[PDB]
Short mmCIF file of C-alpha atoms in Angstrom, two decimals:
data_model
loop_
_atom_site.label_atom_id
_atom_site.label_comp_id
_atom_site.label_asym_id
_atom_site.label_seq_id
_atom_site.Cartn_x
_atom_site.Cartn_y
_atom_site.Cartn_z
CA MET O 1 -10.33 2.32 -15.49
CA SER O 2 -8.38 1.39 -18.72
CA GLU O 3 -7.74 -2.86 -18.53
CA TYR O 4 -3.99 -4.36 -18.21
CA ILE O 5 -2.85 -7.18 -19.44
CA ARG O 6 0.52 -9.49 -19.47
CA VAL O 7 0.98 -11.17 -23.08
CA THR O 8 3.59 -13.09 -24.25
CA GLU O 9 5.10 -14.25 -28.36
CA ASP O 10 7.62 -16.54 -26.88
CA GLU O 11 7.95 -18.04 -23.27
CA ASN O 12 12.02 -18.37 -23.73
CA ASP O 13 11.49 -14.18 -23.41
CA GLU O 14 9.82 -11.52 -21.43
CA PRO O 15 6.49 -11.62 -21.22
CA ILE O 16 4.94 -8.36 -22.56
CA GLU O 17 2.50 -5.81 -21.08
CA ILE O 18 -0.42 -4.40 -22.71
CA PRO O 19 -2.30 -1.37 -21.76
CA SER O 20 -5.62 -2.33 -22.55
CA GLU O 21 -9.16 -0.16 -23.34
CA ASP O 22 -10.92 1.92 -19.84
CA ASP O 23 -13.71 0.20 -22.85
CA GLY O 24 -12.34 -3.14 -21.35
CA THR O 25 -11.40 -4.07 -24.72
CA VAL O 26 -8.31 -4.78 -26.54
CA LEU O 27 -6.96 -3.15 -29.91
CA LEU O 28 -4.92 -5.33 -32.53
CA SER O 29 -3.08 -2.29 -33.18
CA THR O 30 -0.84 -2.13 -29.80
CA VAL O 31 -0.64 -6.03 -30.45
CA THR O 32 1.22 -5.59 -33.86
CA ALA O 33 3.47 -2.75 -32.75
CA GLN O 34 5.47 -5.28 -30.80
CA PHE O 35 4.47 -8.28 -32.39
CA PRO O 36 4.59 -7.79 -36.38
CA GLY O 37 2.85 -9.90 -38.99
CA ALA O 38 0.88 -11.59 -35.80
CA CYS O 39 -3.01 -11.05 -34.80
CA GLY O 40 -5.31 -12.75 -32.45
CA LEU O 41 -5.07 -13.69 -28.81
CA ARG O 42 -4.61 -16.97 -26.45
CA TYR O 43 -4.94 -17.75 -23.23
CA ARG O 44 -6.24 -21.35 -20.88
CA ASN O 45 -8.74 -21.46 -18.05
CA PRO O 46 -8.15 -22.73 -14.91
CA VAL O 47 -11.04 -24.00 -15.31
CA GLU O 48 -10.23 -26.51 -17.55
CA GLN O 49 -6.69 -25.92 -17.93
CA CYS O 50 -6.99 -25.97 -21.57
CA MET O 51 -5.63 -23.18 -23.89
CA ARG O 52 -8.50 -20.43 -25.27
CA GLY O 53 -8.57 -18.22 -27.34
CA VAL O 54 -9.71 -14.49 -26.59
CA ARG O 55 -12.47 -13.75 -29.14
CA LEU O 56 -11.85 -10.26 -31.96
CA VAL O 57 -14.43 -8.29 -33.64
CA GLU O 58 -13.28 -5.44 -35.76
CA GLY O 59 -9.83 -5.96 -34.45
CA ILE O 60 -11.32 -5.17 -30.44
CA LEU O 61 -10.66 -8.04 -28.44
CA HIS O 62 -12.87 -9.26 -26.02
CA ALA O 63 -11.90 -9.48 -22.32
CA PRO O 64 -13.17 -13.30 -20.80
CA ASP O 65 -15.88 -12.93 -17.95
CA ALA O 66 -13.60 -11.36 -15.44
CA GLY O 67 -11.57 -9.32 -17.51
CA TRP O 68 -8.49 -9.62 -18.91
CA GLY O 69 -5.96 -8.62 -15.47
CA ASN O 70 -6.01 -12.32 -13.95
CA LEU O 71 -4.68 -14.73 -16.70
CA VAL O 72 -1.71 -14.58 -18.66
CA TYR O 73 -2.07 -14.22 -22.80
CA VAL O 74 -0.29 -15.00 -25.52
CA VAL O 75 0.18 -13.48 -28.91
CA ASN O 76 -1.13 -15.61 -31.98
CA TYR O 77 1.74 -15.92 -34.54
CA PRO O 78 2.16 -17.06 -37.72
CA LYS O 79 5.33 -19.16 -39.18
CA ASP O 80 5.60 -15.77 -40.71
CA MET K 1 5.68 20.72 -30.83
CA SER K 2 3.81 20.52 -28.10
CA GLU K 3 5.53 18.22 -25.94
CA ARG K 4 8.46 15.41 -26.66
CA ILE K 5 9.52 12.74 -26.39
CA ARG K 6 12.98 10.68 -25.53
CA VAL K 7 12.81 7.40 -28.09
CA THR K 8 15.66 4.77 -28.54
CA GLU K 9 16.15 1.47 -30.36
CA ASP K 10 19.48 0.58 -29.21
CA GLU K 11 20.16 2.37 -25.96
CA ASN K 12 24.42 1.81 -27.73
CA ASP K 13 23.37 5.18 -29.19
CA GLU K 14 21.59 7.90 -28.68
CA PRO K 15 17.51 8.10 -27.56
CA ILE K 16 16.34 10.52 -30.11
CA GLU K 17 13.31 13.18 -29.94
CA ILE K 18 10.11 12.93 -31.37
CA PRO K 19 6.93 15.65 -31.26
CA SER K 20 4.21 14.25 -29.63
CA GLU K 21 1.03 15.87 -28.94
CA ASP K 22 -1.20 18.16 -26.50
CA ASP K 23 -4.17 15.29 -26.80
CA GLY K 24 -1.60 12.87 -26.12
CA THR K 25 -1.27 10.75 -29.15
CA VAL K 26 1.83 10.08 -31.93
CA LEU K 27 1.88 10.52 -35.50
CA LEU K 28 3.10 6.90 -37.19
CA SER K 29 4.74 9.16 -39.38
CA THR K 30 5.94 11.87 -37.54
CA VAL K 31 7.42 7.91 -36.10
CA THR K 32 9.18 6.79 -38.66
CA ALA K 33 10.07 10.13 -39.68
CA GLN K 34 12.33 9.10 -37.74
CA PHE K 35 12.91 5.97 -37.39
CA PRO K 36 13.76 3.96 -40.80
CA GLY K 37 10.44 2.48 -40.60
CA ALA K 38 9.36 1.55 -36.85
CA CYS K 39 6.52 1.47 -35.17
CA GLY K 40 5.02 0.94 -31.31
CA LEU K 41 6.79 2.17 -28.29
CA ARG K 42 7.27 0.53 -25.34
CA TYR K 43 9.29 -0.01 -22.20
CA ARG K 44 11.00 -1.57 -19.73
CA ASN K 45 8.37 -2.17 -17.21
CA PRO K 46 9.66 -1.57 -13.90
CA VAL K 47 6.47 -3.05 -12.17
CA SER K 48 5.93 -6.39 -14.33
CA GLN K 49 9.53 -6.37 -14.84
CA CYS K 50 8.56 -7.07 -18.27
CA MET K 51 8.13 -4.29 -21.48
CA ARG K 52 4.93 -3.02 -21.28
CA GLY K 53 3.81 -1.85 -24.43
CA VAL K 54 2.07 1.65 -25.77
CA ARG K 55 -2.14 1.55 -26.97
CA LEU K 56 -1.86 1.83 -31.22
CA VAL K 57 -4.89 2.87 -33.29
CA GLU K 58 -4.27 2.72 -36.86
CA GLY K 59 -0.58 4.50 -36.47
CA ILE K 60 -1.91 6.91 -33.95
CA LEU K 61 -0.01 6.04 -30.41
CA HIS K 62 -2.20 6.90 -27.59
CA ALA K 63 -0.43 7.95 -24.54
CA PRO K 64 -1.78 6.48 -21.20
CA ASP K 65 -3.07 9.21 -18.28
CA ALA K 66 -0.25 9.41 -17.28
CA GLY K 67 1.48 10.69 -20.79
CA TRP K 68 4.04 9.71 -22.63
CA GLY K 69 7.16 11.10 -19.89
CA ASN K 70 6.61 7.73 -18.49
CA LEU K 71 7.07 5.23 -21.32
CA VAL K 72 10.19 7.16 -23.46
CA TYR K 73 12.23 4.90 -23.62
CA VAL K 74 12.46 1.94 -26.56
CA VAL K 75 10.75 2.36 -29.86
CA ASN K 76 9.52 -1.09 -31.31
CA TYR K 77 10.14 -2.58 -34.61
CA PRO K 78 8.60 -4.54 -37.35
CA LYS K 79 10.18 -7.15 -39.44
CA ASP K 80 8.58 -5.29 -41.90
#
């Protein structure tokens, strides 16, 4: 089954739901669809309450230990 | 023609329709053929009350297992 994630570009608005691949990874192109100019992904680990960045390779974001559907994610946005 | 997909950018006007492919895929060019530069698609997800986007890969949109009929609503628009 395809993993499911909930990202957010701006916390003042509503979060965005992203359908991931069955592989358990997320495709950056799906992010760029809703987020133009943006790339990358962040989240916070409930372990140390610190912000973290999701691993990316060739446009493919790699899920954490438990996967995607457990925490919230934030899309990396530049100043532009 | 194979499947058609309803989609709009603003609910004040009338939603348009784009021919999707039998493989559950839509071509970016077909979307931009309708919209003046729009990319990606999403909709009001009643499940999370957020905006759920659709899988995108190199300009090719990939429908979920259900298909396009459950996501036919709003098209995405980049800043460029």
